[PDB]
Structures are given as C-alpha cells and as structure tokens.
Amino acid sequence: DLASLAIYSFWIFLAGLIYYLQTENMREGYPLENEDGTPAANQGPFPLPKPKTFILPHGRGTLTVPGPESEDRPIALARTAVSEGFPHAPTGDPMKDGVGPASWVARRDLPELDGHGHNKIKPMKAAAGFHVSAGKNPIGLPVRGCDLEIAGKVVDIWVDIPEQMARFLEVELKDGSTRLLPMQMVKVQSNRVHVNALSSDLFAGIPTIKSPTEVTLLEEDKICGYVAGGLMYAAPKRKS
Amino acid sequence: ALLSFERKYRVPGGTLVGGNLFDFWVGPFYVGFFGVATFFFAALGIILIAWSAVLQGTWNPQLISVYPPALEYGLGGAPLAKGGLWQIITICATGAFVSWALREVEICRKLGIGYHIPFAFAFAILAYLTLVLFRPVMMGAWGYAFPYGIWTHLDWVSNTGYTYGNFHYNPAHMIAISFFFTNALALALHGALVLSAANPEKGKEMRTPDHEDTFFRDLVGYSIGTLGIHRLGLLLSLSAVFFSALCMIITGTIWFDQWVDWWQWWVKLPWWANIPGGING
Amino acid sequence: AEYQNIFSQVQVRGPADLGMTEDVNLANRSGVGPFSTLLGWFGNAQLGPIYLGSLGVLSLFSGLMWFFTIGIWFWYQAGWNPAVFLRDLFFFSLEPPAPEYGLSFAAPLKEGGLWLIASFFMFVAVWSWWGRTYLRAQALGMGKHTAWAFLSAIWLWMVLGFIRPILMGSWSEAVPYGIFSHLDWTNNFSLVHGNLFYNPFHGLSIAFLYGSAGLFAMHGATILAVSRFGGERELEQIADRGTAAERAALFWRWTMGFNATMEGIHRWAIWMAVLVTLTGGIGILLSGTVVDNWYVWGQNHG
Ligand code: BCL
Ligand code: BCL
Ligand code: BCL
Ligand code: BCL
Ligand SMILES: CC[C@H]1c2cc3[nH]c4c(c3C)C(=O)[C@H](C(=O)OC)c4c3nc(cc4[nH]c(cc(n2)[C@@H]1C)c(C(C)=O)c4C)[C@@H](C)[C@@H]3CCC(=O)OC/C=C(\C)CCC[C@H](C)CCC[C@H](C)CCCC(C)C
Ligand SMILES: CC[C@H]1c2cc3[nH]c4c(c3C)C(=O)[C@H](C(=O)OC)c4c3nc(cc4[nH]c(cc(n2)[C@@H]1C)c(C(C)=O)c4C)[C@@H](C)[C@@H]3CCC(=O)OC/C=C(\C)CCC[C@H](C)CCC[C@H](C)CCCC(C)C
Ligand SMILES: COC(C)(C)C/C=C/C(C)=C/C=C/C(C)=C/C=C/C(C)=C/C=C\C=C(C)\C=C\C=C(/C)CC/C=C(\C)CCC=C(C)C
Ligand SMILES: CCCCCCCCCCCC[N+](C)(C)[O-]
Ligand SMILES: CCCCCCCCCCCC[N+](C)(C)[O-]
Ligand SMILES: CCCCCCCCCCCC[N+](C)(C)[O-]
Ligand SMILES: CCCCCCCCCCCC[N+](C)(C)[O-]
Ligand SMILES: CCCCCCCCCCCC[N+](C)(C)[O-]
Ligand SMILES: [Fe+3]
Ligand SMILES: [K+]
C-alpha cells in the first residue's frame, strides 16, 4: 500500500540525505593524513564533495573548499613512540610555540569587519557612544593570576560593535605595555579581575597586537590559544 | 589517520586517572582510562544482553527484550533469567554513560576547552537514572523501570502513561514538551539563519552577523544574537530534559491519581468555585 | 571558580543599531524599542526596530482576528463573567462543525461556523507570515533557508487543519481551538487510529525531536566551550577556520570518531529539526486516509 511505499521511499531519501550531510562536513580537514603529513591510505567510504566558493565581502577574496590543506606554520612537536596513535611531545615551551591546548591557526592577519566594512572589535575608548550599561565595570581593577599575584590592571574593554558585547579586557603590565585577555577567561569580581588560566609571570608572554586599536584574526587566535593553554601548562604554579 | 590540522593538538596531558598509561588514540578515538572503563562496561553489558537473548530464545533485534524484576521482588536481587540480568545490565549502562562523560572531560582538558558538553550530557544520564533508579527506588520496586527492548519500552511508556489517565495533563510534562518543541523551533531557525547568511543569493557576497541580527529584527522585532542563540539552545534542550525527569519523578510518588484531576485545585479556588455558568458550573 | 559564559558579566551598549539596509525599504521599519538590561544578561539587550509593510499588517491583523474570534467564543461560553472566564480558561473550546456538515460552509455560527471563520483568519495569518520570511531574506540578499524550514512546520499544521480534513471529507476531523480540548483531540486521534506508536512516521518524528534536543545541546555546549576562542563568530570561522572550529571538530572526532565543520553542523541542524514536522505530517496525513489502524498495518509490515 501507499504507506509502505512512503516509508520505503523515506529511508532511501534519508540515506541520500546522510550521504549529502556527511560529505558537506568534509569540506575542511580532509583528506586525512598520517602523522607525518602525508595522505593516509584509508580515507573511508565517503568521497570529497565538489568544491564550492564563498565570496567574501569588502574585497577580501573568496574561499574554495575543499582545497589544498596546510598548516602554514611550523609545529614544534615530536613523536614519543615508534608507531601511530601516541602523543606528540612539545620540542620547546608549548605556550611559546603555540601547540597543544596553546595552539593557534594561521588565520588571515586582518581584522574581522562588520557589515559596513569597519573593524568589528575596538577598544571601547575609540568606539563612539559605547559604555558599560550593567554589571561591575572592570576598568581600573587590578588583575590577578592563578599564582595569586597581581599581574597588571584593566585599562579598557574591547567591544564587538555590531553585536554590542565585551570581547577582551586590555590589561597593562608593570612595563607599561598592554595585552588582551579573552572576556570568557576572566572573572570580574568586586575588587579584582581573576584569571585562573595564567600565573602572573606568564602575562608578558601573551602575544602582542601590532596596532594598538585593532586586532587581527591571526592575533586573536594566538592570544586566545595562549591563554587557554595556561590551564594545562601553568598548572604547576596554580594553587589553593 | 588524522584531520589535516589535528597533530598539533595531540600532545600529552589532561588525563584524570593513570597519568600517561592510557594517553593515546585508536584511529580517531581518544582512549584514556575512561575509554577503557567505557569499553569494559559496554562490552560486559552487551555480552549480558546477548546471554539474555539466548535465555529468551531469540536473536531478532526487534524482539530481544530484557525485563526488570517483577514487582514482587521489590528492591531485592532477582535470579538472572528473571530480572537479574536487567539489574546488572543497568549497572553496566550507568557505568558506561558516566565513563563516557568523564572521558569527554579528559578530552576537554587536553583540548583546553570548557566542560559544557559533558555537563550537558549529564542531564541525559540523570533522566535515564530517574527512570531506572530514582523513580523505582522511591516507588519501592525495580519492576517500575522500563525494559530494554525496542518495542517493549514503548509498551512501558504507553502502560505507564495511561495508568494516570491521559498523561498530557501532568503539568511538568506540559512544560517539558513546550521546551522540546521550542527547542526544535530554535534549532531550525538557527541552522537556517547561519546558512542563509553563508549561502546568499547567487553571486552575492557572504552576509555578516549584522545581517542575521537584521533579519530577525525585521521579522519579529528582536534578535537574541550569536552568543545568545547558543546559550538558548543549550538552555531549552537541558530544560526540556530537566522537566522530563521532574514530570516522571513526581508521578507514582507525590501524585499517583489521574493527572486530569490535579487541575481541580484551580477550578475550586473559593472566589469562583461556585459561580454558575461556564464549563465547570 | 571558572566563569562559564552562560550569563554575561558585563554589558555594553552603544548607539541603537538600525541594521543593514541592502534592498530593504526603510520607510517600513519602525524605530527602536527600549533596551532591556534583563535580556542583556543572556542575549542582546536591544528591542526593535521591526519591519511592518503591507503583508506584515495583513498577517498581524488576520492573526489578531483569529485570536479574538476564539476569545469571543470563550467569553460567550463563560456567560461574560470574568471570574468564570479565568476559572474555566483551559476548558473552553471552539470546535469545528459536526460530521454532518461535511466540508460545507453551512453550519450555524455557534456549531462550526465560527470555527471556520477563526480558521480562515489563521490560514491568512500564517501564509502571509510565510511570504514575509521569504521577502525579508530576499530584501537582504540572503538565502531562503528560513522560509524553507518554516514550510516544514506549515506542512504539519496544514495537514492537521486543512489537507487531512479535506481528504476525509469533513471539517469535524480538524483540531479544535482550546488548551485542554486540543490535547483530548490528540489522545483521541491516537486511540482511534490504533495507537500512533505503531505509525513508523511517528517513531521517526520522535527520533528527530529527541535528536533536535541532543544536537542543540551538543552544538550549544560546543560553541560555548570554544567561545574563549571566538567560536560563536561562526560566519567568519566558516570563511577562515580558526582554532575554535578546530578544537570543536576534534572534541567530537576524539569522542565519537567523526565530526562536523562550522558550516555543515548547521546543515545537520536544519535537517534534524525540519524532519520532525516533515515525517510527522506524512504520518498524520496517512492516518485514516490510507491506514485506519496502525497496529493492524504494522502486523502486515505493509
Ligand atoms: C503535536 C500534536 C498536537 C499538539 C499537542 C500538544 C501537547 C501534548 C502539548 C502541546 C502544548 C502546546 N500546544 Mg499543542 N499540539 C498541536 C498543535 C498546536 C498548534 C497549532 C498546530 O497551531 C498550536 C498553536 C499549539 C499550541 C500549544 C501551546 C498551547 C502549548 C506549547 C506550544 C509550544 O511551546 O510551541 C512553540 C513555542 C513558542 C514559544 C511559539 C508559540 C507561543 C504560544 C505559546 C502559542 C500560542 C497558543 C495560544 C494562542 C496561547 C493562549 C494562552 C491563553 C489562552 C491566553 N499546538 C497538535 C494538534 N501541544 C503543550 C502544553 O502545555 O499544552 C498545555 C503540551 O503539553
Ligand atoms: C501514552 C503515552 C503518554 C505519555 C507518557 C509518557 C511517559 C511514561 C514518559 C513520557 C516522557 C516524555 N514525554 Mg510523554 N506521553 C504522551 C504524549 C507525549 C507527546 C505528545 C505530542 O502527545 C509528547 C511530545 C511527549 C513528550 C514527552 C517528553 C517530555 C518525554 C520524553 C523525553 C525524555 O524524557 O528524554 C530523556 C532522555 C533519555 C531518557 C535518554 C537518555 C540517554 C542515555 C543517557 C544514553 C543512551 C546511550 C545509548 C544506549 C547509546 C547506544 C550506542 C550507540 C553507539 C548509539 N509525550 C502520552 C499522552 N511520556 C518520558 C519522560 O519524561 O522520561 C523522563 C516518560 O517516561
Ligand atoms: C525518552 C523516553 C522513553 C523513550 C520513549 C520513546 C518513544 C515514544 C520512542 C522512542 C524511540 C526510540 N528509543 Mg526510546 N525511550 C526511552 C529511552 C530510550 C533509551 C535509553 C537508553 O534511555 C534508548 C537507548 C532509547 C532508544 C530508542 C530508539 C530505539 C528509538 C529512536 C531514539 C532516538 O532516535 O533518539 C535520538 C537519538 C540520539 C540523540 C542519538 C541516536 C541514538 C540511537 C538511534 C539509539 C539506538 C540505541 C540502540 C538500539 C540500543 C541498543 C544498545 C546496544 C546494546 C548497543 N530510548 C525512554 C523510556 N523512545 C522511537 C521508536 O521508533 O521506537 C521504536 C519512539 O517512537
Ligand atoms: C496519547 C497521545 C499519543 C500521541 C499522539 C500524537 C498526535 C495526534 C500527533 C503527535 C505528533 C508528535 N508526537 Mg506523539 N503521541 C503520543 C506519544 C508521544 C511521545 C511519548 C510517548 O514520549 C513523544 C515524545 C511524542 C512526540 C511527538 C512529536 C515528535 C510529534 C509532533 C512534532 C511537533 O513539533 O509538533 C509541533 C509543531 C507543530 C504543531 C507545527 C505548528 C506550526 C504552525 C504553522 C504554527 C502556528 C502558530 C500560531 C499561528 C500561533 C502563533 C502564536 C505566537 C505567539 C505568535 N508523542 C501518544 C501515542 N502525537 C504529531 C505528529 O506529527 O504525529 C506524527 C501529531 O499530529
Ligand atoms: C521545523 C519544525 C519546528 C518549527 C519551525 C519554524 N517555526 C517557525 C519558523 C520555523 C522555521 C518561522 O520562520 C516562523 C517564525 O517567524 O519564527 C520566529 C515560525 C513560527 N512558529 C510559530 C509557532 C509554533 N511553532 C511550532 C513548532 C515548530 N516550528 C516545529 C517544532 C509550534 C508548536 C510546537 O506548537 C508553535 C506554537 C510562530 C512563533 C511562528 C509563525 C508566526 C505566524 O505564523 O504568525 C501568524 C500570527 C500572528 C502574526 C499574530 C497572532 C496573534 C497572537 C496570538 C497575539 C497574542 C498576544 C497579544 C499581545 C494579546 C492582545 C490582547 C489584549 C487586547 C489584552
Ligand atoms: C540532555 C539533552 C539531550 C541529549 C544530550 C546529549 N546526548 C549526548 C551528549 C549530549 C550533550 C553527548 O556528549 C553524547 C555523545 O557523545 O553524542 C554524540 C550523547 C549521547 N547521547 C546518546 C543517545 C541518546 N540521547 C538521548 C537524549 C538526549 N541527549 C537529550 C534529549 C536519547 C533518547 C532521547 O532516547 C538517546 C538514545 C548517545 C548516542 C551518546 C552517548 C553514548 C555513550 O554513552 O556511549 C557509551 C555507551 C555505549 C557505547 C553503549 C552502552 C551499552 C549498554 C551497557 C547496554 C545497553 C543498555 C541500554 C539501556 C539499552 C536500552 C535500549 C532500549 C531503550 C531500546
Ligand atoms: C482577554 O479576552 C480577549 C477577548 C481580549 C481575547 C482572549 C482570547 C483567547 C482566550 C484566546 C485563546 C486562544 C487559544 C487557547 C487558542 C488555541 C489554539 C490551539 C491549541 C490550536 C491548535 C491547533 C490548530 C490547528 C492544527 C489549526 C490548523 C488550521 C488550519 C490549517 C487552517 C485551515 C483553514 C480552514 C479550515 C479555512 C478554510 C476556509 C476557506 C474559506 C477556504
Ligand atoms: C535519494 C537522494 C535524495 C537526498 C538528497 C538531499 C539533498 C538536499 C540538499 C539540496 C542542495 C543541492 N545543492 C548541493 C545543489 O545545493
Ligand atoms: C545518524 C547518525 C549520524 C550518521 C552517521 C554518519 C557517520 C559518518 C562516519 C564518517 C567517517 C569519517 N571518517 C573521517 C572517519 O572517515
Ligand atoms: C503550580 C505550577 C503551575 C504550572 C503549570 C502551567 C503549565 C502551562 C504550560 C505553558 C504554556 C502556557 N500557555 C498556556 C499560556 O501558553
Ligand atoms: C524565547 C524562549 C521562550 C521561553 C518559553 C518556552 C515555553 C516554556 C513554558 C513555560 C516555562 C515555565 N518556567 C520554566 C519559566 O517556569
Ligand atoms: C512540503 C514541505 C517541504 C519543506 C521541505 C524544505 C526543506 C528545506 C531545508 C533547507 C534546504 C534548502 N536548501 C536551499 C539548502 O537546499
Ligand atoms: Fe551555531
Ligand atoms: K566610547
């Protein structure tokens, strides 16, 4: 009957839908590789889809995927075993080298832009009309790391203009330079901002931005990666 | 085999138990101590289900069914073939699910991400436990739990529901359903919105999140925003499960009559109880 | 302890955002509403503007009239007594014509006619709201994913109120307008068709419904977990994959052995959700038209 036909057709549709969905989700990261960067022998049963091209706004070009994959940066790790599937040890200081949970991707070294082509994120001092509208204003608070020592002080908030939200705290260190801290990695308290991921001595090693009133996607990745990496790599200097 | 970008993240560390002893992968899968624990609990549980099938006399996946002890056993143990297997399989399931969650926690730690995913999963675990552990214990017997079979668990859902009349009238169930439906509505809208911006009309440039906010303001006068919508899907999905668990935990324990009758507390409030007219006068 | 990014710690506000212009007729946007600090702990604080063209006004007027037609029936059933109106609010019901009227428009106001009027208004409200989801996307140069998704919901609604009654040859088959009565209708529908648990389209619909909650819990949780690297800026992660997108992928690859992309997760999402009402509408449409009893149908596989 008709119900039998409908249910049989539906499962055929669903198998086709799943094939389409899985292949769409292979537009990044594939083909799979061995640990040494060469193509793996076993790619599995789904082939790569035909490329699509996204047209990016404001003259930034296009992206075509899938396309040739590469890291575009050195990776300071080495095998710890003679066969596949074991961890790779940092060959230096993993925080400075940007590996493990301190990792960063070689994103475009330009700022993300809003829909009018202005910088998406700006220090609040240069964002006209923007101010703190609720909650404890962090500006002026001392900033404490997980060693319980003061690492610096908050001198601004960087804000997402189109979405109206706090993205980073700008923190000045003892030497008078500043660093960005991801808003999602600080706790604003009544008398301080507390940063569990980093001990005070690691603040200076947070990657710097090249221009003081904008941050490029590359730089946001280095900064956020470095701070998150501290949860694993500053664990010896943390504490209670 | 590794995704093209994967190697830099495969460093040592993050384990909760065992240091480096189980810090490795098998293909794509991370192991860890809790991966070993998962494999053990799951393997045992699956073996025991296969045995329960031999004892039941079938291999058809649509008939295999492991039933908990009948009610006469209360909270005691029961022979294997008469509820005991269920009891052990359930311990194994709990073991495997909790172990899955803790293994997710290890993966979070190695990757330097938040713990939100295992936290969310724990809500599914708590719903499962409400049905097989908490509610049975409070009601005084394992036999109030559901059986492990594809169609038999549906018989349990139907029989349990209609024990209280039309189960639609359980008010915590109404709230639960509201969250499930709202969740799906939000999921449809979120997926469509992102895709409608990433994949604009032919030859146009990708839209921005400013356009996604704009689309929603234009449509309904409000846009929750890109951070908000992810908060929202999380809240709606977890609230739906919270209220599911709640609607069951109260049923057969604090309320055990027909759910339709619970609503009489509103109808009978003194100020309008006796006014003639309407449906209830 | 560690901040979790469920609620914001600090709100910021700037000039009201009037939005992108693209091909939109600006004469038709309102001005901004108030700002809600309350909302702003969780999402955006800003309310409005909204767009209100001719279609918008039609949809709103029609929808209001649907709602008021029902409410006026409720006041009548209440004997115009406010106390009875509130006491019995969930028990009132505006019911479709009896089966003897078939698909005719001939039933008196009190015994079906008013249900039809309320329904006509709903039909206009929803379909003009649909045209609006298409047109607001079009004016901004956006894909039509929202209107396509909304159409899957419309399908179940249309089946329940309009297509299934038409094929069964009577309006008495349609859902009544009331809180409790629509639940009674739903229970009854299942009993009358031999228990919907045996309808395979209903089981699929459930699997997608539960699947939607699983996936949004997974996906919402995942984005929040990588929000420390800008994860929720999904369109730019699509355009230019960052460490947020990579860590998210790998969480899942390591956990369950495969993973999505930042764009493709949204394709898993839209389909998981639309398959709920898609499968659902099919299931309901077949009930009584082609299959009188799902237990019986299931015994015959076909
Ligand atoms: C799927 C099979 C059944 C069905 C079975 C059930 C079951 C079972 C339950 C509901 C529940 C609901 N159903 Mg129903 N319901 C059906 C089809 C519908 C249709 C329709 C087709 O137009 C509507 C409008 C509703 C509406 C409703 C709401 C009263 C409620 C929560 C819905 C929600 O969260 O969704 C989306 C969420 C949104 C936020 C968008 C919509 C917002 C509002 C709430 C909808 C307006 C409805 C009405 C005008 C409100 C009047 C309130 C006062 C009288 C003023 N149902 C079909 C016929 N429905 C739950 C409930 O609590 O009932 C008491 C419940 O447990
Ligand atoms: C005749 C039946 C009654 C009725 C009787 C009941 C009964 C009885 C129950 C419900 C419950 C529910 N009802 Mg009801 N309900 C009715 C009608 C409805 C209608 C409707 C439109 O009419 C709707 C929408 C609902 C919706 C709901 C939900 C609130 C809830 C189910 C989800 C849940 O608990 O998730 C929770 C999620 C889980 C339990 C899954 C847990 C997963 C675990 C952690 C992991 C599994 C791993 C797996 C084994 C791995 C395999 C390995 C492979 C690699 C994949 N009901 C009718 C009136 N309803 C249930 C509820 O609240 O339960 C708490 C419940 O018990
Ligand atoms: C939640 C409230 C009720 C319940 C009420 C219903 C109702 C009503 C329906 C189902 C249906 C299903 N239920 Mg149930 N179900 C319950 C609890 C469970 C549990 C559990 C471990 O707690 C499991 C594993 C299942 C599993 C199932 C599937 C067989 C089916 C589709 C689910 C789905 O797609 O979800 C979403 C999926 C995910 C989030 C991931 C997908 C997981 C896969 C599909 C699960 C396969 C599990 C496998 C068969 C178990 C074998 C274990 C082996 C030893 C490995 N239910 C409780 C008792 N369930 C539907 C059906 O068609 O039944 C025949 C149906 O109509
Ligand atoms: C005793 C009850 C019966 C039962 C009888 C039914 C009946 C009858 C139906 C379902 C349907 C469903 N059942 Mg059932 N079902 C039972 C038990 C269950 C159980 C369980 C036991 O755990 C579960 C989990 C479910 C789950 C489900 C859902 C998967 C499915 C509805 C999906 C949906 O999103 O609809 C909600 C979405 C909509 C209704 C779309 C509405 C869209 C329109 C366009 C919105 C208009 C809004 C309006 C204008 C108001 C605006 C107000 C605003 C504020 C502006 N059922 C038992 C066996 N079930 C439905 C289905 O598809 O079955 C296959 C259905 O018709
Ligand atoms: C894929 C399936 C899921 C789905 C998807 C979905 N729904 C959608 C869409 C999509 C993709 C939309 O694009 C569309 C939308 O605009 O979303 C914001 C919509 C929508 N889904 C809606 C509801 C809805 N969806 C539901 C379900 C689902 N939607 C499924 C789970 C349900 C359930 C679960 O029952 C409901 C109730 C609406 C919010 C919206 C469609 C809006 C619409 O059609 O409006 C017509 C009506 C009006 C314009 C006005 C109605 C009048 C009000 C009732 C007035 C009440 C208040 C008033 C202030 C009272 C005044 C009285 C005083 C005088 C005292
Ligand atoms: C809390 C919100 C929703 C949700 C969230 C959620 N689920 C999740 C997660 C999250 C955040 C994960 O991180 C985790 C995951 O890895 O997904 C890919 C998961 C998951 N949710 C799953 C299933 C699932 N979730 C469900 C529901 C939900 N999950 C909620 C609606 C359901 C329903 C609704 O029925 C099911 C079936 C799994 C795919 C996965 C967890 C996998 C896991 O724990 O692996 C370890 C265990 C095994 C590999 C096998 C154990 C075998 C047992 C020992 C024996 C079988 C006993 C069982 C009781 C038989 C019952 C069968 C019958 C009922 C038919
Ligand atoms: C406070 O008092 C006032 C007066 C101010 C207002 C109060 C109002 C109240 C209390 C309103 C309450 C409304 C309620 C409770 C509404 C509940 C609605 C529900 C639960 C609806 C559920 C399902 C409805 C469905 C499936 C409807 C489907 C309808 C269609 C598909 C439309 C079909 C169109 C038809 C039949 C018309 C065809 C006509 C022509 C001419 C072709
Ligand atoms: C049996 C096969 C049916 C399942 C196919 C589902 C694909 C739906 C998506 C349509 C998008 C088409 N595309 C790639 C040209 O954009
Ligand atoms: C319905 C549940 C989700 C559908 C399952 C699709 C799983 C695809 C597995 C892809 C294998 C990927 N890889 C890279 C390991 O080859
Ligand atoms: C004493 C606790 C009472 C809580 C029960 C209320 C359940 C209502 C369900 C939510 C939908 C509300 N509604 C009908 C206005 O749409
Ligand atoms: C924008 C999301 C709208 C949230 C409302 C969803 C319907 C839930 C039903 C009533 C919720 C009752 N609760 C939990 C607040 O007590
Ligand atoms: C009769 C109801 C049918 C509605 C089904 C429409 C599915 C829409 C889901 C999005 C797919 C659209 N697109 C353009 C990506 O192909
Ligand atoms: Fe998303
Ligand atoms: K400023």
Together in a domain, C200 and C184: yes
Together in a domain, B53 and B158: yes
Together in a domain, B128 and B23: yes
Together in a domain, B12 and B146: yes
Residues forming beta bridges with residue A179, ordered by sequence position: A171
CATH number of the domain where residue B24 is located: 1.20.85.10
Contact at CB, C224 and B230, closer than 8 angstroms: yes
DSSP label at A207? P
Together in a domain, B223 and B252: yes
CATH of A2-106, one of 3.40.50.150, 4.10.540.10, 2.120.10.30, 1.10.8.420: 4.10.540.10
Together in a domain, C67 and C196: no
Contact B223, C140 (CB under 8 A): no
Which residue is closest to A106 within chain B, CA to CA? B5
Show the tokens assigned to A156: 């601004």
Which residue is closest to C10 within chain A, CA to CA? A135
Show the tokens assigned to A47: 């082939």
Together in a domain, C93 and C165: no
Q: What Cα–Cα distance (Å) separates residue B106 from each residue in A15, A83, B112?
A: 33, 23, 10
Contact A135, C11 (CB under 8 A): yes
Q: Write down the experimental method used for this entry.
A: X-ray
Together in a domain, C237 and C96: no
DSSP label at C76? H
Atom of ligand 3 nearest to the CA of B49: 54
Residue B25 lies in a domain: yes
How many domains are contained in chain C? 2
Chain C: give the shortest CA distance to residue A184, in Å.
Answer: 5
> End of a domain among B130, B145, B163?
B163
Which phi and psi (to 5°) does residue C44 adopt? -70, 140
**Cα angle vertex B253, ends B247, B256, to 5°?**
85
CA distance A220 to A204: 16
CATH topology of domain A107-240: Photosynthetic Reaction Center; Chain H, domain 2 (3.90.50)
Together in a domain, C139 and C276: no
Give buried/exposed letters for C219-241 (b at 16+ CB in 10 A, else e).
Answer: bbbbbbbbbbbbbbbbbbbbbbb
Show the tokens assigned to B225: 């925003």
CA distance A166 to A194: 16
Residue owning tokens 């991707």: A105
Q: Is C266 annotated in some ligand binding site?
A: yes
Provide residues with CB under 6 Å of ligand 6: B 38, 41-42, 45-46, 89, 92-93, 96-97, 100, 104, 117, 120-121, 123-124, 148, 150, 153, 237-238, 241; C 210, 213-214, 217-218, 221, 255-256
Chain A: give the shortest CA distance to residue B64, in Å.
Answer: 23
Q: Of B170, B177, B178, B265, which is best to mutate to test ligand 10, by the most ligand atoms within 8 angstroms of its C-beta?
A: B178
- Of residues B40, B30, B232, the one with CA closest to residue C252: B30
> End of a domain among B104, B139, B163?
B163
Residue B117 lies in a domain: yes
Q: What Cα–Cα distance (Å) separates residue A143 from each residue in A75, A179, A187?
A: 32, 12, 10
Helix (H, G, I), strand (E, B) or coil at A165: strand
Together in a domain, C180 and C134: no
Residues forming beta bridges with residue C277, ordered by sequence position: none
Contact at CB, B8 and A77, closer than 8 angstroms: yes
Contact C161, C167 (CB under 8 A): no
Helix (H, G, I), strand (E, B) or coil at C38: helix
Residue B280 lies in a domain: no
Those residues with Cβ within 8 angstroms of residue C94's Cβ, 6 or more apart along the chain or in another chain: C69, C70, C73, C74, C114, C115, C118, C176, C177, C178
Which amino acid, residue A130?
Answer: F
Residue owning tokens 């890109």: B226
CA nearest ligand 2 atom 26, residue: B177
Contact C78, B269 (CB under 8 A): no
Together in a domain, B258 and B151: no
Contact B96, B125 (CB under 8 A): no
CA distance B268 to C3: 47
Domain of B214, in residue numbers = 164-263
Q: Which ligand is nearest to the CA of C63?
A: 5
Together in a domain, C66 and C131: yes
* Torsion-angle region of A79 (φ positive above 0: left; ψ -120 to 50: alpha; else: beta): beta
Contact B7, A85 (CB under 8 A): no
Chains with ≥3 CB–CB distances under 8 Å to C: A, B
Which phi and psi (to 5°) does residue A41 adopt? -70, -45
The residue extents of the domains of chain A are: 2-106, 107-240
Helix (H, G, I), strand (E, B) or coil at C177: strand
- Of residues C28, C33, C27, the one with CA closest to residue C57: C28
Contact C228, B114 (CB under 8 A): yes
Strand-strand pairing, A193-194 and A142-144: parallel
- Of residues B84, B88, B104, B87, the one with CA closest to residue B38: B104
**A70 contact residues in B (CB cutoff 8 A):** 4
Residue B274 lies in a domain: no
Residue B269 lies in a domain: no
Together in a domain, C148 and C295: yes
Domain of C170, in residue numbers = 144-302
Together in a domain, B158 and B173: no
Which amino acid, residue C208?
Answer: F
CA distance C261 to C237: 9
Show the tokens assigned to A106: 């070689």
Together in a domain, B140 and B40: yes
Together in a domain, C95 and C155: no
CA distance B185 to B182: 5
How many domains are contained in chain B? 2
Show the tokens assigned to C27: 């004469």
Contact C228, B156 (CB under 8 A): no
Neighbouring CB atoms inside 10 A of C158's CB total: 17
Together in a domain, C133 and C271: no
CA distance A172 to C97: 74
Together in a domain, C7 and C97: yes
CA distance B165 to C191: 13
> End of a domain among C85, C116, C143?
C143
Q: Is C252 annotated in some ligand binding site?
A: yes
* Residue C146 alpha carbon to ligand 12 centre in Å: 9
Together in a domain, B177 and B64: no
CA distance B5 to C273: 30
Chain A: give the shortest CA distance to residue B202, in Å.
Answer: 10
CA distance C260 to C226: 15
Give the DSSP H or E segment for C5: none
Q: Is C168 exposed, middle or buried (0-12, 13-18, 19+ CB in 10 A)?
A: middle
Provide residues with CB under 6 Å of ligand 4: B 157, 181, 184; C 122, 125-126, 153-154, 156-157, 160, 186-187, 189-190, 196-197, 201-202, 205-206, 209, 276-277, 280, 283-284
* Residue B28 alpha carbon to ligand 9 centre in Å: 11
For residue A190, the Cα-to-chain-centroid distance in whole angstroms is 28
Chain B: give the shortest CA distance to residue A26, in Å.
Answer: 10
Show the tokens assigned to B188: 């449809």
CA distance B167 to C190: 13
> End of a domain among B163, B181, B204?
B163
> End of a domain among C143, C177, C209?
C143
Those residues with Cβ within 8 angstroms of residue A235's Cβ, 6 or more apart along the chain or in another chain: none
Contact C213, B237 (CB under 8 A): yes
Which amino acid, residue A50?
Answer: K
Residues forming beta bridges with residue A98, ordered by sequence position: none
Residue B232 lies in a domain: yes
**B269 contact residues in C (CB cutoff 8 A):** 87
CA distance B266 to B250: 19
Q: Which ligand is nearest to the CA of B167?
A: 2
DSSP label at A78? E
Together in a domain, B242 and B104: no
Evaluate: CB of B2 within 6 angstroms of ligand 3. Answer: no
* Torsion-angle region of C49 (φ positive above 0: left; ψ -120 to 50: alpha; else: beta): beta
Q: Does C206 touch chain B (CB under 8 A)?
A: no
CATH number of the domain where residue C7 is located: 1.20.85.10
* Residue B87 alpha carbon to ligand 2 centre in Å: 21
Contact at CB, A87 and B23, closer than 8 angstroms: yes
Q: Is B210 exposed, middle or buried (0-12, 13-18, 19+ CB in 10 A)?
A: buried
Together in a domain, C149 and C231: yes
Residue B275 lies in a domain: no
Q: Which ligand is nearest to the CA of B199?
A: 12
Residue ranges of the alpha helices (H) in chain B? Answer: 32-56, 84-111, 116-129, 135-139, 152-162, 171-198, 209-220, 226-249, 264-267
**A10 contact residues in C (CB cutoff 8 A):** 201, 204, 279, 282
Neighbouring CB atoms inside 10 A of C58's CB total: 17
CA distance C96 to A37: 68
Largest CA distance in chain C: 68
CA distance B62 to A149: 63
Contact C178, C185 (CB under 8 A): no
Contact B245, B126 (CB under 8 A): yes
- CA torsion, points B71, B73, B76, B79, in degrees to nearest 10? -120
Contact C177, C118 (CB under 8 A): yes
**Cα angle vertex C92, ends C88, C98, to 5°?**
155
Provide the resolution (angstroms): 2.2
Which amino acid, residue A15?
Answer: A
Helix (H, G, I), strand (E, B) or coil at B272: coil
Residue B277 lies in a domain: no
DSSP B92-138: HHHHHHHHHHHHHHHHHHHHT--SHHHHHHHHHHHHHHIIIIIHHHH
Which amino acid, residue A122?
Answer: K
